[PDB]
Amino acid sequence: TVFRQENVDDYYDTGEELGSGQFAVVKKCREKSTGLQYAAKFIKKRRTKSSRRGVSREDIEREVSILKEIQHPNVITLHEVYENKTDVILILELVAGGELFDFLAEKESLTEEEATEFLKQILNGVYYLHSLQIAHFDLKPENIMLLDRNVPKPRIKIIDFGLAHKIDFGNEFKNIFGTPEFVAPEIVNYEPLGLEADMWSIGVITYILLSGASPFLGDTKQETLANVSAVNYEFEDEYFSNTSALAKDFIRRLLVKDPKKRMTIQDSLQHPWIK
């Protein structure tokens, strides 16, 4: 697809560098016409099939396609897309609240009920995405942001749709990817993928959110993958002594190897722990 060919500097003022990925760098910018702040994500193009640097115009085309379709309070929103000879620039909503977990890193330690409030927002955004048959495939702590950390009730924002896919009927998807510690066995074992993968990740998130420890993180890359596939984890008393039976049941129904027997997003919203 053809994106805006005009120079981004004609419409925005470049600023500080918010973050930085492997094949992408994000900067803080301000639209000249409105004075409003946004985030500029520069994705370097591959433009050379044999090249292992940059992103293919198939992966870029896909992420923007998903983004352009998204429109929910708990998910990042796309403003504009530009491109030149070396980059594809995505002007995205500015999310400067930082990582949810780093915000919770502040004492006055979260009550189980207060923890549910934040998870609820995560479920809300996932609910919205799955309803559109969209699997994020990269749900983990660092992609769970806050719009503003200086308000009574901080709003969580789900970002980074670099791995997101549109689950279409017929023709399955199996590719291997993501971060070992937060991926589902179907991803590790190169098996057919669907929306059930995000639900697994959510269970990993809640597990960490409530205990502060990871359920499958091992001493090495191999050990972690083995813990995931074998779905071996425990609720050691040292971390789950103050966790209700409902909170554990909720996680158990998400950390299940068989994708078809794993709770769906709609099932999680009606779970007695979520109410």
Side-chain angles (χ1 to χ4, degrees):
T1 77
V2 187
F3 299 127
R4 300 197 67 189
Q5 250 71 298
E6 30 245 300
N7 198 317
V8 184
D9 289 334
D10 293 342
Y11 301 84
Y12 301 77
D13 285 307
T14 313
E16 170 194 343
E17 177 177 298
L18 307 174
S20 184
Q22 182 176 299
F23 292 131
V25 60
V26 294
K27 295 182 169 303
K28 191 149 57 190
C29 63
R30 171 177 285 92
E31 185 165 49
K32 298 178 181 178
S33 62
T34 61
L36 302 176
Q37 289 194 136
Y38 290 99
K41 186 181 190 176
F42 301 77
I43 299 172
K44 194 179 70 178
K45 298 175 174 189
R46 183 172 69 170
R47 67 176 184 169
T48 317
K49 278 191 162 56
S50 57
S51 179
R52 288 185 178 177
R53 297 156 65 194
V55 186
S56 62
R57 206 134 192 303
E58 192 187 10
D59 287 9
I60 295 180
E61 217 64 276
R62 190 160 51 234
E63 166 174 25
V64 293
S65 196
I66 306 291
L67 289 173
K68 192 170 293 183
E69 211 189 313
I70 314 303
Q71 201 59 289
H72 188 277
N74 290 304
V75 304
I76 194 163
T77 167
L78 182 64
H79 180 56
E80 281 193 303
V81 188
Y82 294 71
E83 63 166 344
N84 49 208
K85 63 184 64 180
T86 64
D87 300 68
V88 165
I89 317 80
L90 304 190
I91 309 299
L92 303 154
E93 162 184 29
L94 174 54
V95 177
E99 284 171 40
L100 170 67
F101 278 43
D102 288 317
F103 168 83
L104 262 52
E106 167 46 56
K107 287 59 192 177
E108 306 291 61
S109 55
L110 266 287
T111 290
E112 185 168 299
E113 299 212 55
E114 302 178 63
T116 308
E117 278 190 290
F118 286 108
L119 206 192
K120 219 103 70 176
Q121 298 188 58
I122 300 179
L123 301 184
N124 244 283
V126 181
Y127 180 66
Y128 170 80
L129 297 162
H130 287 191
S131 299
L132 276 335
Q133 275 293 75
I134 297 179
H136 187 262
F137 283 140
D138 198 22
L139 291 175
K140 60 183 172 186
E142 72 176 55
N143 285 333
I144 301 174
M145 301 294 267
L146 291 170
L147 214 185
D148 190 322
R149 67 206 306 294
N150 298 303
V151 292
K153 301 249 293 182
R155 180 143 81 269
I156 81 90
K157 278 284 183 174
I158 291 186
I159 66 177
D160 195 358
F161 289 70
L163 295 172
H165 271 267
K166 192 66 165 303
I167 295 173
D168 300 300
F169 207 81
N171 308 306
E172 297 293 293
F173 185 55
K174 296 151 62 182
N175 185 57
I176 302 178
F177 50 84
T179 308
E181 173 175 37
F182 314 96
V183 298
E186 318 89 80
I187 296 178
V188 182
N189 304 311
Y190 188 58
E191 271 149 53
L193 313 168
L195 287 321
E196 313 90 345
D198 293 336
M199 295 320 295
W200 170 282
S201 303
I202 286 174
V204 171
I205 307 294
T206 83
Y207 182 109
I208 301 177
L209 174 73
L210 301 175
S211 68
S214 185
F216 300 111
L217 182 58
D219 296 317
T220 65
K221 199 83 160 184
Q222 272 83 309
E223 208 156 61
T224 304
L225 288 179
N227 287 319
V228 173
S229 184
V231 302
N232 80 299
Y233 72 94
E234 279 173 40
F235 289 128
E236 297 175 59
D237 188 31
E238 187 185 311
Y239 301 90
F240 290 88
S241 64
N242 306 314
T243 304
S244 67
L246 282 177
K248 295 194 204 64
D249 182 70
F250 175 90
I251 294 173
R252 292 210 189 74
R253 293 176 183 287
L254 287 167
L255 298 183
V256 306
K257 193 182 171 76
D258 191 356
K260 201 180 189 302
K261 292 181 63 170
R262 191 176 301 156
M263 271 207 287
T264 56
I265 187 58
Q266 25 281 125
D267 278 334
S268 71
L269 273 311
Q270 306 307 317
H271 187 276
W273 187 55
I274 301 304
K275 265 295 186 180

